[PDB]
């Protein structure tokens, strides 16, 4: 199976744009791509990560199971809604069914590696275990990232889910002393697959695809599948 | 009677969750309960930008027993700040010695970290978690009520448990008035994974010596504070 979960060390690290960027680089390397966002939150304020991926990367196989108005973690959103999260089997089977030869399937999380994604108490980490996915970790270059990154890497190793690398979701211009130091330090604890230029989220599709093709190592991307 | 001190390491789930004001608030509450409090800060970065958590704690809580060790000018991770200055990180032993020298019967010693549990504090790869194991400390974790808090807190709690460092509980470092939906929901969720010791009023850091003292006494359960040292 060729499945990556995509998970972020915090809110607003640029998780969705990383999914779009990897999706774009993979499509340009001639690889078929599906993206799954089992649970979407914050729809009241207009959130729809699957649409963002479609627009930015041209991905057409875009799968989801539930959408909640509240900008809360899934469990909290569902609780406020009075409506349970999806079942564990729903998520795992959805993903397993997307999986095809020559196809890269990306699973975008909601709320972090360790929060409940499905009933009862099932996390993105658990889903990763069930479908033998490695995890691509989206990080900032800001103060605090080394701690969050190490914490996440420990949590992944705790259940023997492979780390497929880090992506810095937003690389500042100009970087600065902290970002520059963090990027070297991040590279000492794991492979940095890409650092997406700040503001990439605003690009048109064509500019986005050019950025994405440049951001990732093409041998790495092709090797995934 | 406890013939040695109680040690708590005070760690945050991320940057700027209010660890220092929490140390001061606990210190102030414990002092008002008749407990002698020391506060220790093994590694202080950002000194060239005026950062001094020990000085801040003394200001806020009137704590006199303030123990420092390494100070680095640049406001970055210890390892980077030390390298920038052509300085070394301290050794594990130096940190453990700084703490152990504070031992008095029935003292409460608060060991304030530098920027998250797994931040490297000593070479090679020695963290606040390691120090906590060395001195048999429990860990008090400082959290936000903001979106992202549940993952951060769970990551921190898991890492504590991995090396058998007990969680002394959670402190919400800044609690808004009034709480929005998200903050209120997050507080309920946080209380389900661990004991929430306090939620300090937003703006606590700017309170008077007198007002901060009153805030601190009201913020913690007096039974919990009183039980910390036997």
Short mmCIF file of C-alpha atoms in Angstrom, two decimals:
data_model
loop_
_atom_site.label_atom_id
_atom_site.label_comp_id
_atom_site.label_asym_id
_atom_site.label_seq_id
_atom_site.Cartn_x
_atom_site.Cartn_y
_atom_site.Cartn_z
CA UNK A 1 0.00 0.00 0.00
CA UNK A 2 1.24 3.53 -0.80
CA UNK A 3 -0.31 5.80 1.79
CA UNK A 4 1.02 8.82 3.66
CA UNK A 5 -0.77 10.49 6.51
CA UNK A 6 -0.06 14.22 6.63
CA UNK A 7 -0.05 15.66 10.11
CA UNK A 8 0.92 19.02 11.58
CA UNK A 9 2.76 19.85 14.81
CA UNK A 10 0.26 22.63 15.51
CA UNK A 11 -2.64 24.59 14.03
CA UNK A 12 -1.86 26.86 11.08
CA UNK A 13 1.42 25.12 10.15
CA UNK A 14 0.24 24.92 6.52
CA UNK A 15 -0.90 21.28 6.46
CA UNK A 16 -3.41 21.60 3.57
CA UNK A 17 -0.96 23.52 1.36
CA UNK A 18 1.69 20.85 2.00
CA UNK A 19 -0.84 18.19 0.91
CA UNK A 20 -1.52 20.26 -2.25
CA UNK A 21 2.22 20.82 -2.92
CA UNK A 22 3.09 17.14 -2.59
CA UNK A 23 0.02 16.22 -4.66
CA UNK A 24 1.17 18.66 -7.39
CA UNK A 25 4.78 17.42 -7.43
CA UNK A 26 3.51 13.82 -7.61
CA UNK A 27 1.11 14.57 -10.50
CA UNK A 28 3.96 16.27 -12.38
CA UNK A 29 6.11 13.17 -11.92
CA UNK A 30 3.35 11.17 -13.67
CA UNK A 31 1.90 9.69 -10.49
CA UNK A 32 -1.82 9.31 -9.83
CA UNK A 33 -2.86 11.04 -6.57
CA UNK A 34 -5.81 10.71 -4.18
CA UNK A 35 -6.31 12.88 -1.14
CA UNK A 36 -8.54 11.89 1.80
CA UNK A 37 -9.72 14.29 4.52
CA UNK A 38 -11.89 12.01 6.68
CA UNK A 39 -13.01 14.85 8.99
CA UNK A 40 -13.27 18.54 8.17
CA UNK A 41 -13.91 21.13 10.89
CA UNK A 42 -14.49 24.89 10.83
CA UNK A 43 -16.90 24.85 7.89
CA UNK A 44 -18.84 27.75 9.44
CA UNK A 45 -15.89 30.06 8.73
CA UNK A 46 -15.52 28.54 5.24
CA UNK A 47 -13.01 25.71 5.68
CA UNK A 48 -12.84 23.02 2.95
CA UNK A 49 -9.37 21.58 2.64
CA UNK A 50 -10.32 19.16 -0.16
CA UNK A 51 -11.46 22.08 -2.39
CA UNK A 52 -8.19 23.89 -1.69
CA UNK A 53 -6.23 20.78 -2.84
CA UNK A 54 -8.42 20.42 -5.97
CA UNK A 55 -7.92 24.08 -6.97
CA UNK A 56 -4.23 24.25 -6.16
CA UNK A 57 -3.09 20.82 -7.43
CA UNK A 58 -5.84 19.60 -9.83
CA UNK A 59 -6.51 16.47 -7.75
CA UNK A 60 -9.86 15.01 -8.62
CA UNK A 61 -9.95 11.99 -6.26
CA UNK A 62 -10.92 13.89 -3.10
CA UNK A 63 -12.58 11.84 -0.37
CA UNK A 64 -14.14 12.84 2.97
CA UNK A 65 -16.72 11.53 5.47
CA UNK A 66 -17.79 14.37 7.79
CA UNK A 67 -17.72 18.15 8.06
CA UNK A 68 -18.39 20.21 11.22
CA UNK A 69 -19.15 23.97 11.45
CA UNK A 70 -17.05 24.61 14.64
CA UNK A 71 -13.29 25.47 14.46
CA UNK A 72 -12.52 22.92 17.16
CA UNK A 73 -10.78 19.55 17.23
CA UNK A 74 -13.02 16.81 15.74
CA UNK A 75 -14.30 15.43 19.10
CA UNK A 76 -15.10 18.91 20.40
CA UNK A 77 -16.79 19.86 17.07
CA UNK A 78 -18.94 16.69 17.03
CA UNK A 79 -19.77 17.18 20.72
CA UNK A 80 -21.02 20.71 20.10
CA UNK A 81 -22.89 19.43 17.02
CA UNK A 82 -24.57 16.65 18.99
CA UNK A 83 -23.46 14.25 16.25
CA UNK A 84 -20.90 11.44 16.63
CA UNK A 85 -17.65 11.21 14.67
CA UNK A 86 -17.27 8.59 11.90
CA UNK A 87 -16.53 4.99 12.91
CA UNK A 88 -13.00 3.57 12.83
CA UNK A 89 -13.92 1.13 10.05
CA UNK A 90 -15.31 3.95 7.89
CA UNK A 91 -12.00 5.79 7.88
CA UNK A 92 -9.74 2.77 7.44
CA UNK A 93 -11.82 1.20 4.65
CA UNK A 94 -12.22 4.51 2.80
CA UNK A 95 -8.43 4.85 2.71
CA UNK A 96 -7.79 1.18 1.91
CA UNK A 97 -10.21 1.46 -1.03
CA UNK A 98 -8.47 4.54 -2.52
CA UNK A 99 -5.18 2.66 -2.52
CA UNK A 100 -4.19 1.58 -6.07
CA UNK A 101 -0.95 0.63 -7.89
CA UNK A 102 1.11 3.62 -9.10
CA UNK A 103 -1.06 5.79 -6.88
CA UNK A 104 -0.02 8.01 -4.01
CA UNK A 105 -2.79 8.33 -1.45
CA UNK A 106 -2.50 11.26 1.00
CA UNK A 107 -4.52 11.29 4.23
CA UNK A 108 -4.88 14.74 5.76
CA UNK A 109 -5.54 14.80 9.50
CA UNK A 110 -7.60 17.22 11.56
CA UNK A 111 -6.43 18.52 14.95
CA UNK A 112 -3.09 16.73 15.34
CA UNK A 113 -1.60 13.24 15.48
CA UNK A 114 -2.98 12.33 18.90
CA UNK A 115 -6.51 13.71 18.99
CA UNK A 116 -9.66 11.63 18.37
CA UNK A 117 -10.54 11.42 14.65
CA UNK A 118 -13.04 8.57 14.88
CA UNK A 119 -15.31 6.89 17.46
CA UNK A 120 -14.27 5.72 20.06
CA UNK A 121 -10.94 7.42 20.85
CA UNK A 122 -9.36 6.50 17.51
CA UNK A 123 -6.53 8.82 16.44
CA UNK A 124 -4.71 9.59 13.19
CA UNK A 125 -1.83 7.60 14.64
CA UNK A 126 -4.15 4.59 15.05
CA UNK A 127 -5.39 4.92 11.45
CA UNK A 128 -1.75 5.07 10.26
CA UNK A 129 -1.04 1.79 12.09
CA UNK A 130 -4.15 0.11 10.66
CA UNK A 131 -3.36 1.00 7.01
CA UNK A 132 0.47 0.75 7.25
CA UNK A 133 0.93 4.41 6.33
CA UNK A 134 4.11 6.36 7.00
CA UNK A 135 3.61 9.90 8.34
CA UNK A 136 4.74 13.13 6.73
CA UNK A 137 5.07 15.79 9.41
CA UNK A 138 4.36 19.46 8.72
CA UNK A 139 6.33 21.83 10.97
CA UNK A 140 7.08 25.53 11.37
CA UNK A 141 10.54 27.06 11.35
CA UNK A 142 9.51 29.14 14.39
CA UNK A 143 10.67 28.96 17.98
CA UNK A 144 9.14 25.86 19.54
CA UNK A 145 9.35 23.67 16.44
CA UNK A 146 12.20 21.42 17.64
CA UNK A 147 10.21 20.50 20.76
CA UNK A 148 6.98 19.85 18.78
CA UNK A 149 8.85 17.94 16.11
CA UNK A 150 10.67 15.72 18.67
CA UNK A 151 7.44 15.12 20.59
CA UNK A 152 5.64 14.05 17.40
CA UNK A 153 8.54 11.82 16.28
CA UNK A 154 8.49 10.11 19.70
CA UNK A 155 4.75 9.60 19.42
CA UNK A 156 5.16 8.04 15.92
CA UNK A 157 7.99 5.71 17.02
CA UNK A 158 5.87 4.70 20.06
CA UNK A 159 3.51 2.81 17.73
CA UNK A 160 6.14 2.02 15.07
CA UNK A 161 4.71 4.31 12.39
CA UNK A 162 7.49 5.37 10.02
CA UNK A 163 8.29 9.03 9.60
CA UNK A 164 8.44 9.89 5.86
CA UNK A 165 10.10 13.22 6.70
CA UNK A 166 9.26 16.84 7.57
CA UNK A 167 7.95 19.65 5.46
CA UNK A 168 8.29 23.25 6.61
CA UNK A 169 4.83 24.52 5.68
CA UNK A 170 5.96 28.14 5.44
CA UNK A 171 9.52 29.31 4.90
CA UNK A 172 9.88 33.06 5.68
CA UNK A 173 11.46 35.79 3.54
CA UNK A 174 13.93 36.76 4.61
CA UNK A 175 14.37 33.76 6.99
CA UNK A 176 16.01 35.26 10.09
CA UNK A 177 18.35 33.85 12.72
CA UNK A 178 15.78 31.58 14.37
CA UNK A 179 14.28 30.09 11.21
CA UNK A 180 17.75 29.51 9.73
CA UNK A 181 19.00 27.76 12.87
CA UNK A 182 15.81 25.69 13.19
CA UNK A 183 16.05 24.46 9.63
CA UNK A 184 19.59 23.10 10.23
CA UNK A 185 18.47 21.64 13.57
CA UNK A 186 15.33 20.07 12.06
CA UNK A 187 17.57 18.50 9.40
CA UNK A 188 19.63 16.83 12.15
CA UNK A 189 16.61 15.03 13.61
CA UNK A 190 14.80 14.10 10.36
CA UNK A 191 14.82 14.49 6.58
CA UNK A 192 13.46 17.86 5.47
CA UNK A 193 11.55 17.01 2.27
CA UNK A 194 10.65 20.62 1.44
CA UNK A 195 10.31 24.12 2.77
CA UNK A 196 7.34 25.85 1.13
CA UNK A 197 7.85 29.56 0.46
CA UNK A 198 5.73 31.83 2.65
CA UNK A 199 2.59 32.91 0.79
CA UNK A 200 2.42 29.83 -1.45
CA UNK A 201 -1.21 29.33 -0.33
CA UNK A 202 -2.21 32.38 -2.43
CA UNK A 203 -0.72 31.23 -5.78
CA UNK A 204 -2.76 30.50 -8.88
CA UNK A 205 -2.76 26.82 -9.97
CA UNK A 206 0.05 27.25 -12.54
CA UNK A 207 2.37 29.17 -10.23
CA UNK A 208 1.54 26.65 -7.49
CA UNK A 209 2.53 23.69 -9.68
CA UNK A 210 5.84 25.37 -10.57
CA UNK A 211 6.56 26.05 -6.88
CA UNK A 212 5.63 22.46 -5.95
CA UNK A 213 7.79 20.84 -8.62
CA UNK A 214 10.73 22.89 -7.37
CA UNK A 215 10.03 22.32 -3.64
CA UNK A 216 10.38 18.54 -3.51
CA UNK A 217 13.16 16.21 -4.64
CA UNK A 218 11.74 14.44 -7.72
CA UNK A 219 13.59 11.20 -6.97
CA UNK A 220 12.06 11.11 -3.51
CA UNK A 221 8.52 11.75 -4.77
CA UNK A 222 8.78 9.13 -7.54
CA UNK A 223 10.29 6.69 -5.04
CA UNK A 224 7.13 6.89 -2.92
CA UNK A 225 5.15 4.84 -5.41
CA UNK B 1 7.45 15.61 58.20
CA UNK B 2 9.21 15.40 54.79
CA UNK B 3 12.97 15.47 55.42
CA UNK B 4 13.63 16.65 51.85
CA UNK B 5 12.03 18.98 49.34
CA UNK B 6 9.27 18.43 46.84
CA UNK B 7 10.48 19.08 43.31
CA UNK B 8 8.26 20.07 40.39
CA UNK B 9 9.52 20.73 36.90
CA UNK B 10 7.35 23.28 35.16
CA UNK B 11 7.11 22.78 31.41
CA UNK B 12 4.99 24.28 28.63
CA UNK B 13 3.21 22.60 25.72
CA UNK B 14 4.67 25.24 23.41
CA UNK B 15 6.05 28.75 23.12
CA UNK B 16 4.52 31.49 25.25
CA UNK B 17 1.87 29.50 27.13
CA UNK B 18 2.81 31.44 30.28
CA UNK B 19 5.20 29.14 32.22
CA UNK B 20 6.80 32.00 34.11
CA UNK B 21 3.55 33.53 35.41
CA UNK B 22 2.46 30.00 36.40
CA UNK B 23 5.68 29.44 38.41
CA UNK B 24 5.08 32.79 40.11
CA UNK B 25 1.40 32.07 40.78
CA UNK B 26 2.18 28.61 42.28
CA UNK B 27 5.09 30.09 44.26
CA UNK B 28 2.84 32.84 45.65
CA UNK B 29 0.07 30.37 46.54
CA UNK B 30 2.52 27.99 48.26
CA UNK B 31 4.16 30.86 50.18
CA UNK B 32 0.74 32.03 51.41
CA UNK B 33 0.20 28.47 52.66
CA UNK B 34 3.40 28.76 54.79
CA UNK B 35 5.57 26.72 52.40
CA UNK B 36 9.10 27.81 51.60
CA UNK B 37 9.55 28.08 47.81
CA UNK B 38 12.64 28.03 45.65
CA UNK B 39 12.50 28.63 41.92
CA UNK B 40 15.22 27.34 39.64
CA UNK B 41 15.89 28.17 35.98
CA UNK B 42 18.82 26.04 34.72
CA UNK B 43 18.91 27.58 31.23
CA UNK B 44 17.85 31.14 30.40
CA UNK B 45 18.08 32.31 26.77
CA UNK B 46 17.20 35.77 25.39
CA UNK B 47 19.13 37.68 28.09
CA UNK B 48 20.31 40.23 25.48
CA UNK B 49 16.64 41.05 24.88
CA UNK B 50 15.94 41.45 28.60
CA UNK B 51 14.52 37.95 29.18
CA UNK B 52 14.93 36.92 32.81
CA UNK B 53 12.26 34.59 34.15
CA UNK B 54 13.79 34.41 37.65
CA UNK B 55 13.74 38.20 37.90
CA UNK B 56 10.09 38.13 36.76
CA UNK B 57 9.12 35.53 39.38
CA UNK B 58 10.78 37.57 42.15
CA UNK B 59 8.90 40.64 40.95
CA UNK B 60 5.52 38.95 40.84
CA UNK B 61 5.62 36.61 43.82
CA UNK B 62 8.31 38.13 46.06
CA UNK B 63 10.33 34.89 45.85
CA UNK B 64 13.90 35.40 47.11
CA UNK B 65 15.31 31.90 46.55
CA UNK B 66 16.09 32.16 42.82
CA UNK B 67 18.63 29.80 41.29
CA UNK B 68 20.12 30.25 37.84
CA UNK B 69 23.01 28.72 35.98
CA UNK B 70 23.40 29.22 32.21
CA UNK B 71 22.50 32.54 30.52
CA UNK B 72 22.61 33.02 26.71
CA UNK B 73 22.05 36.42 25.00
CA UNK B 74 20.06 35.33 21.89
CA UNK B 75 16.33 34.42 22.11
CA UNK B 76 16.47 30.99 20.50
CA UNK B 77 16.68 27.31 21.52
CA UNK B 78 19.43 26.79 24.15
CA UNK B 79 21.65 24.76 21.79
CA UNK B 80 21.47 27.44 19.09
CA UNK B 81 21.82 30.31 21.58
CA UNK B 82 24.87 28.66 23.16
CA UNK B 83 26.49 28.00 19.76
CA UNK B 84 25.76 31.56 18.62
CA UNK B 85 27.66 32.82 21.70
CA UNK B 86 30.54 30.36 21.35
CA UNK B 87 29.36 28.96 24.70
CA UNK B 88 28.71 25.39 25.84
CA UNK B 89 25.45 24.00 27.17
CA UNK B 90 25.71 22.95 30.81
CA UNK B 91 26.34 19.30 31.72
CA UNK B 92 23.49 17.15 33.05
CA UNK B 93 25.34 16.97 36.39
CA UNK B 94 25.59 20.72 36.76
CA UNK B 95 21.81 21.00 36.37
CA UNK B 96 21.12 18.20 38.85
CA UNK B 97 23.62 19.79 41.28
CA UNK B 98 21.99 23.24 40.99
CA UNK B 99 18.68 21.64 42.06
CA UNK B 100 19.99 19.29 44.72
CA UNK B 101 21.82 22.14 46.47
CA UNK B 102 18.42 23.73 47.10
CA UNK B 103 17.28 20.80 49.26
CA UNK B 104 15.68 21.77 52.61
CA UNK B 105 13.05 19.78 54.53
CA UNK B 106 9.50 20.73 53.38
CA UNK B 107 10.67 23.11 50.66
CA UNK B 108 8.82 23.34 47.34
CA UNK B 109 11.26 23.69 44.46
CA UNK B 110 9.92 24.69 41.02
CA UNK B 111 12.28 23.94 38.11
CA UNK B 112 11.28 26.07 35.11
CA UNK B 113 12.27 24.67 31.69
CA UNK B 114 13.29 26.53 28.57
CA UNK B 115 10.62 26.18 25.80
CA UNK B 116 9.10 22.69 25.88
CA UNK B 117 9.72 19.29 27.50
CA UNK B 118 12.11 17.91 24.84
CA UNK B 119 14.15 21.08 24.36
CA UNK B 120 17.84 20.11 24.65
CA UNK B 121 19.17 21.67 27.88
CA UNK B 122 22.49 19.82 28.21
CA UNK B 123 24.65 17.86 25.79
CA UNK B 124 24.02 15.35 24.39
CA UNK B 125 20.25 15.57 23.93
CA UNK B 126 19.59 15.87 27.67
CA UNK B 127 16.16 17.39 28.35
CA UNK B 128 13.98 18.62 31.22
CA UNK B 129 12.39 15.13 31.15
CA UNK B 130 15.81 13.53 31.90
CA UNK B 131 16.42 16.03 34.74
CA UNK B 132 12.99 15.18 36.16
CA UNK B 133 13.94 11.48 36.19
CA UNK B 134 17.28 12.31 37.87
CA UNK B 135 15.80 14.32 40.72
CA UNK B 136 12.57 12.28 41.02
CA UNK B 137 10.39 15.31 40.16
CA UNK B 138 6.81 15.34 38.98
CA UNK B 139 5.89 17.63 36.07
CA UNK B 140 3.44 20.52 36.06
CA UNK B 141 2.37 21.27 32.46
CA UNK B 142 1.33 24.71 31.26
CA UNK B 143 -1.23 24.77 28.46
CA UNK B 144 -3.37 27.16 26.38
CA UNK B 145 -7.15 26.81 25.92
CA UNK B 146 -6.61 27.66 22.21
CA UNK B 147 -7.22 25.33 19.23
CA UNK B 148 -4.21 23.00 19.02
CA UNK B 149 -4.00 22.59 22.80
CA UNK B 150 -5.34 19.02 22.98
CA UNK B 151 -2.76 17.57 20.60
CA UNK B 152 0.07 19.51 22.25
CA UNK B 153 -0.99 18.45 25.74
CA UNK B 154 -1.42 14.76 24.76
CA UNK B 155 2.03 14.79 23.07
CA UNK B 156 3.56 16.19 26.27
CA UNK B 157 1.72 13.79 28.59
CA UNK B 158 2.70 10.78 26.46
CA UNK B 159 6.36 11.78 26.52
CA UNK B 160 6.28 12.22 30.33
CA UNK B 161 4.73 8.74 30.75
CA UNK B 162 7.32 7.18 28.42
CA UNK B 163 10.02 7.83 31.07
CA UNK B 164 7.67 7.39 34.02
CA UNK B 165 7.63 11.06 35.05
CA UNK B 166 4.37 11.63 36.86
CA UNK B 167 2.08 14.49 35.76
CA UNK B 168 1.30 16.81 38.71
CA UNK B 169 -1.48 18.30 36.58
CA UNK B 170 -2.25 21.05 34.11
CA UNK B 171 -2.29 24.82 34.42
CA UNK B 172 -4.04 27.00 31.82
CA UNK B 173 -1.61 29.94 31.69
CA UNK B 174 -4.11 32.45 30.30
CA UNK B 175 -7.87 32.08 30.65
CA UNK B 176 -10.03 34.60 28.77
CA UNK B 177 -13.03 36.47 30.16
CA UNK B 178 -15.47 35.55 29.06
CA UNK B 179 -14.45 32.18 27.63
CA UNK B 180 -15.56 31.61 24.03
CA UNK B 181 -17.03 28.31 22.88
CA UNK B 182 -13.67 26.89 21.83
CA UNK B 183 -11.85 27.83 25.07
CA UNK B 184 -14.72 26.44 27.21
CA UNK B 185 -14.88 23.18 25.27
CA UNK B 186 -11.09 22.82 25.39
CA UNK B 187 -11.05 23.29 29.16
CA UNK B 188 -13.61 20.50 29.56
CA UNK B 189 -11.57 18.23 27.26
CA UNK B 190 -8.33 19.07 29.13
CA UNK B 191 -9.97 18.15 32.46
CA UNK B 192 -10.73 14.68 30.98
CA UNK B 193 -7.09 13.80 30.29
CA UNK B 194 -5.61 15.30 33.51
CA UNK B 195 -6.30 17.38 36.64
CA UNK B 196 -6.51 21.09 35.83
CA UNK B 197 -4.82 22.76 38.81
CA UNK B 198 -5.63 26.35 37.80
CA UNK B 199 -6.58 28.66 34.97
CA UNK B 200 -4.93 32.04 35.49
CA UNK B 201 -6.88 35.15 34.39
CA UNK B 202 -5.64 36.66 31.14
CA UNK B 203 -3.51 39.65 32.09
CA UNK B 204 -2.37 38.04 35.39
CA UNK B 205 1.21 39.00 34.50
CA UNK B 206 0.45 42.73 34.76
CA UNK B 207 -1.21 42.54 38.20
CA UNK B 208 0.07 44.32 41.33
CA UNK B 209 2.12 42.51 43.95
CA UNK B 210 -1.04 42.63 46.07
CA UNK B 211 -3.45 41.76 43.30
CA UNK B 212 -1.18 38.97 41.99
CA UNK B 213 -1.03 37.50 45.53
CA UNK B 214 -4.82 37.50 45.80
CA UNK B 215 -5.15 36.05 42.27
CA UNK B 216 -2.67 33.27 43.12
CA UNK B 217 -4.41 32.26 46.37
CA UNK B 218 -7.76 32.08 44.54
CA UNK B 219 -6.39 30.24 41.47
CA UNK B 220 -5.24 26.95 43.05
CA UNK B 221 -7.08 24.46 45.24
CA UNK B 222 -5.69 25.03 48.74
CA UNK B 223 -5.80 21.33 49.59
CA UNK B 224 -3.71 20.52 46.49
CA UNK B 225 -1.11 23.20 47.26
CA UNK B 226 -1.03 22.26 50.96
CA UNK B 227 -0.53 18.58 50.08
CA UNK B 228 2.51 19.25 47.86
CA UNK B 229 5.02 19.05 50.74
CA UNK B 230 3.56 16.32 53.01
#
